[PDB]
Amino acid sequence: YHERRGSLCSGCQKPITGRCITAMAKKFHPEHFVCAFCLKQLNKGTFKEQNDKPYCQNCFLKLFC
């Protein structure tokens, strides 16, 4: 019954307790919004994409550069 909240990950609607990515004002589990190369972590500040598939720049660039 603590009180430490966070930010619901829109789509999951579950508080994000740790790191939180923001979108069109929506929040996102920093994980459920990872890069599709190394699905472990992405950042809206370095989130690259192609064909709709998320990617870290270092990841996407490695493909088409």
Partner: protein, 94 residues
């Protein structure tokens, strides 16, 4: 065209497409990617994975040339540049 100095079955084939063999060591399988001597390595790991489609080891993916025991990480050059081709069997491992 077709001539190219030879004829067609070899002076054409249909479009100059040769599938590169890929011995997956993390799976022990052998996959082939219909490519050409103009695809960038980062272009192969992409397709091979696309066929996979799963939260499987995607970062642990990289092609190596045992005929060179190297790590194909030169996304700048291509197959032709190095000289790779269908006679060159690559592998899909970290």
């Amino acid at each position: 065209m077709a001539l190219d100095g030879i004829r067609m079955p070899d002076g054409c084939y249909a479009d100059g497409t040769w599938e590169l063999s890929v011995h997956v060591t993390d799976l022990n399988r052998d996959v082939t990617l219909r490519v050409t001597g103009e695809v960038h390595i980062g272009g192969v790991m992409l397709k091979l994975v696309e066929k996979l489609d799963v939260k499987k080891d995607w970062s642990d993916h990289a092609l190596w040339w045992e005929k060179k025991r190297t790590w194909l990480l030169k996304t700048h050059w291509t197959l032709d540049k190095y000289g790779i081709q269908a006679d060159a069997k690559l592998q899909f491992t970290p």
